[PDB]
Ligand binder design. Sequence first.
Ligand SMILES: *[C@@H]1O[C@H](CO)[C@@H](O[C@@H]2O[C@H](CO)[C@@H](O)[C@H](O)[C@H]2NC(C)=O)[C@H](O)[C@H]1NC(C)=O
Ligand SMILES: *[C@@H]1O[C@H](CO)[C@@H](O[C@@H]2O[C@H](CO)[C@@H](O)[C@H](O)[C@H]2NC(C)=O)[C@H](O)[C@H]1NC(C)=O
Ligand SMILES: *[C@@H]1O[C@H](CO)[C@@H](O[C@@H]2O[C@H](CO)[C@@H](O)[C@H](O)[C@H]2NC(C)=O)[C@H](O)[C@H]1NC(C)=O
Ligand SMILES: *[C@@H]1O[C@H](CO)[C@@H](O[C@@H]2O[C@H](CO)[C@@H](O)[C@H](O)[C@H]2NC(C)=O)[C@H](O)[C@H]1NC(C)=O
Ligand SMILES: *[C@@H]1O[C@H](CO)[C@@H](O)[C@H](O)[C@H]1NC(C)=O
Ligand SMILES: *[C@@H]1O[C@H](CO)[C@@H](O)[C@H](O)[C@H]1NC(C)=O
Ligand SMILES: *[C@@H]1O[C@H](CO)[C@@H](O)[C@H](O)[C@H]1NC(C)=O
Ligand SMILES: *[C@@H]1O[C@H](CO)[C@@H](O)[C@H](O)[C@H]1NC(C)=O
Ligand SMILES: *[C@@H]1O[C@H](CO)[C@@H](O)[C@H](O)[C@H]1NC(C)=O
Ligand SMILES: *[C@@H]1O[C@H](CO)[C@@H](O)[C@H](O)[C@H]1NC(C)=O
Ligand SMILES: *[C@@H]1O[C@H](CO)[C@@H](O)[C@H](O)[C@H]1NC(C)=O
Lengths: 48, 223, 97, 167, 115
Amino acid sequence: ATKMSECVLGQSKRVDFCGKGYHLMSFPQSAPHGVVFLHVTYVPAQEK
Amino acid sequence: AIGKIQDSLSSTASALGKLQDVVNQNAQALNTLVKQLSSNFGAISSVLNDILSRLDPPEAEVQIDRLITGRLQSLQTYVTQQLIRAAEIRASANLAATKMSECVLGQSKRVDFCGKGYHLMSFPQSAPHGVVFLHVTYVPAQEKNFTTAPAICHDGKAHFPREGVFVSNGTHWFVTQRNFYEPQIITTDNTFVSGNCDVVIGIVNNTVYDPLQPELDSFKEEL
Amino acid sequence: TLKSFTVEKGIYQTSNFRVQPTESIVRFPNITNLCPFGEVFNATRFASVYAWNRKRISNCVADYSVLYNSASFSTFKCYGVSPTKLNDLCFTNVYAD
Amino acid sequence: DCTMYICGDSTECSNLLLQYGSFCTQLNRALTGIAVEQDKNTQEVFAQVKQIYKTPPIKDFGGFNFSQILPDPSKPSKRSFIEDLLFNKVTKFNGLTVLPPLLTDEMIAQYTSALLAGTITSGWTFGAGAALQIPFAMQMAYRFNGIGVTQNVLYENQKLIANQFNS
Amino acid sequence: FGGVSVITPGTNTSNQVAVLYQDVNCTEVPSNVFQTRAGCLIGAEHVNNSYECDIPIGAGICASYQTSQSIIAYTMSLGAENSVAYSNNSIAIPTNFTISVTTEILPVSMTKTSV
Ligand SMILES: *[C@@H]1O[C@H](CO)[C@@H](O[C@@H]2O[C@H](CO)[C@@H](O)[C@H](O)[C@H]2NC(C)=O)[C@H](O)[C@H]1NC(C)=O
Ligand SMILES: *[C@@H]1O[C@H](CO)[C@@H](O[C@@H]2O[C@H](CO)[C@@H](O)[C@H](O)[C@H]2NC(C)=O)[C@H](O)[C@H]1NC(C)=O
Ligand SMILES: *[C@@H]1O[C@H](CO)[C@@H](O[C@@H]2O[C@H](CO)[C@@H](O)[C@H](O)[C@H]2NC(C)=O)[C@H](O)[C@H]1NC(C)=O
Ligand SMILES: *[C@@H]1O[C@H](CO)[C@@H](O[C@@H]2O[C@H](CO)[C@@H](O)[C@H](O)[C@H]2NC(C)=O)[C@H](O)[C@H]1NC(C)=O
Ligand SMILES: *[C@@H]1O[C@H](CO)[C@@H](O)[C@H](O)[C@H]1NC(C)=O
Ligand SMILES: *[C@@H]1O[C@H](CO)[C@@H](O)[C@H](O)[C@H]1NC(C)=O
Ligand SMILES: *[C@@H]1O[C@H](CO)[C@@H](O)[C@H](O)[C@H]1NC(C)=O
Ligand SMILES: *[C@@H]1O[C@H](CO)[C@@H](O)[C@H](O)[C@H]1NC(C)=O
Ligand SMILES: *[C@@H]1O[C@H](CO)[C@@H](O)[C@H](O)[C@H]1NC(C)=O
Ligand SMILES: *[C@@H]1O[C@H](CO)[C@@H](O)[C@H](O)[C@H]1NC(C)=O
Ligand SMILES: *[C@@H]1O[C@H](CO)[C@@H](O)[C@H](O)[C@H]1NC(C)=O
């Protein structure tokens, strides 16, 4: 419930609270006796 | 709002049900533990003095053993339920301490951690075996429809707002902050330049006012 | 159930529902053979202590009412099964030592 | 059921157990409290939105595809394809009964649909208060500004980000 | 067999009750009889209209004491349906706000018992 309130209903600035990387937003999905989150995160790829 | 909370607390007795259930559950556990002394547990009587005053030790030890087994089972069950309830209460108290530290001693940017809406600050109030928070929140009330665009062309360059978004009332375009409607003239101080008009999807045409030009109108007169 | 004369608004589990039986069904094999306990108990000669006899008894119906009724038995002790409820039970095999 | 379990269909066993007083009642009460608090957890985790939102029939979300997470109207229960795959994966008479949940799977699907539609169409404004419709490109610009990244990045690579999200 | 649950409002309000026979069909039970997935419900009138849940029953059915007054049974209302006017060039920006105070109550401790 905390993850939903701070991660689906808004944007979380807590590190690794909503998956690996810079969190952007999440999707809720129903599960049997549970809930499944699809965390959309921003991860840098190519470096110099 | 303070008056409304006062009226609600004076009128609704079920507001403090979250503490009333804890007190009632403790009362139920204590009453069950007291009432379990009335059970015979298979012996001739539930009164230890009655058993002692009627039986010599060769049968009294057996009957007393039955009473001790029953009362030990009752005590162990009571202590186990008390431990589980104390753990839950500990979790609630840890949540309350976290709420105090992040919400009264500062400002919380976590959504719905300090009540519904944009949290500002909170007040602590004492409660019987508990704590009561008065979360002061910011909630928008009255809304309007506007026509928007992600960026604006000025001279082929793409302008993006430093703060706020681009809105239009139908004839003119303005930039205003996200949580309140305060229309301002789109200037170079409000926007920044990045890229051109050929990559963004949805850019519109306008003019971006430049603060230096007027002083330059004085300059043609100056020349 | 709540041990109170005032019940708060809500739903409460008070008792359990059971469908009571209508009639009793008693089923036993329809064998009417008299049982040979008479020659076991009323034999002229009984065997020795070490050479105790063993009679395998099957395919009969046993009232045991004569065993209840005879007061000649000075000692009558039943251990695994209580003596009174013997005729209501059907057993696989019985041995009469 | 305590009496059904320990003493099924026996008057004599029930009379013997009755000497243990309220041992039987306490067990049923704890299980009833558990059964109440699981519905409490379900309501706390799912019923976080005051209104049931729904997406418009036109899926013009700036190239972002949500057909794999939006509910499928063709199914008997309006559940997504991803929700369906999850449901398929996860799989007596002595007084041991199972009480049904207060909230059925269709209502859980409706709550997730309302939350997802509110998120997609409004960002965090539906959670803060009344929903404010936001086009999804500028909503992603809000999210990019929330991680210290200038929005010019999203607009100039909107196609790349949409393709990466779909993949 | 099954559990017997009694659905009632406060006794100061009414003495009318509705009885739920859990996990059974409405055949072995010895008008106003309804059938839910939570069991057989007797004494509650079925209502097509949906309201907020007051007394939960199971499988999305909740009971309440409404209008003359009687115990009614209905499917849960999950909230007022509100479609959003989404568009690719439409924004809703608030022009006014309100300051609201909400009360959040949390337990801290319990009775320091000692036996
Ligand atoms: C959109 O806002 C602009 C800015 O206020 C409006 O333009 C002004 O309109 C008033 C009439 O109420 C005139 O007196 C001003 O001279 C206008 N200013 C300029 C710079 O043109 C415009 O009318 C608004 N349009 C709509 C449809 O509301
Ligand atoms: C915004 O204004 C520019 C002009 O500054 C428009 O660009 C014109 O596009 C048409 C169609 O390709 C060309 O025929 C013209 O030659 C362009 N103008 C110039 C000066 O080169 C642009 O189309 C406008 N965009 C919108 C959405 O109105
Ligand atoms: C979103 O993705 C789905 C697939 O996940 C697309 O649906 C497919 O559309 C093609 C037509 O181009 C069909 O041949 C496939 O059979 C469809 N698959 C499924 C599973 O429905 C859908 O078109 C995409 N929508 C957008 C707007 O990109
Ligand atoms: C924003 O809303 C508040 C109310 O929440 C408005 O304040 C009221 O204004 C009316 C005048 O139309 C007064 O009669 C009321 O007494 C005011 N209420 C209070 C509590 O002071 C306010 O005017 C609105 N502002 C805007 C710009 O719309
Ligand atoms: C930066 O230089 C180090 C030198 O040890 C090298 O190992 C590293 O790969 C370089 N980074 C990139 C992105 O080339
Ligand atoms: C914006 O337009 C939609 C059109 O469907 C309307 O329903 C909504 O009420 C409008 N918003 C305001 C604040 O008037
Ligand atoms: C917005 O949607 C309209 C259709 O209602 C379409 O004509 C227009 O091209 C779209 N604009 C963008 C930037 O997607
Ligand atoms: C043995 O004979 C006596 C009669 O003297 C009779 O009463 C008794 O029932 C007989 N025992 C059995 C086992 O039939
Ligand atoms: C119960 O109902 C009676 C009226 O029958 C009312 O006077 C009383 O105040 C009510 N009590 C509560 C606390 O609801
Ligand atoms: C009750 O029995 C009928 C058949 O008479 C059946 O159609 C129905 O589905 C049953 N209901 C339940 C809840 O078992
Ligand atoms: C609900 O309405 C339908 C008609 O659409 C009717 O057949 C049904 O009996 C109604 N149910 C109740 C409980 O009123």
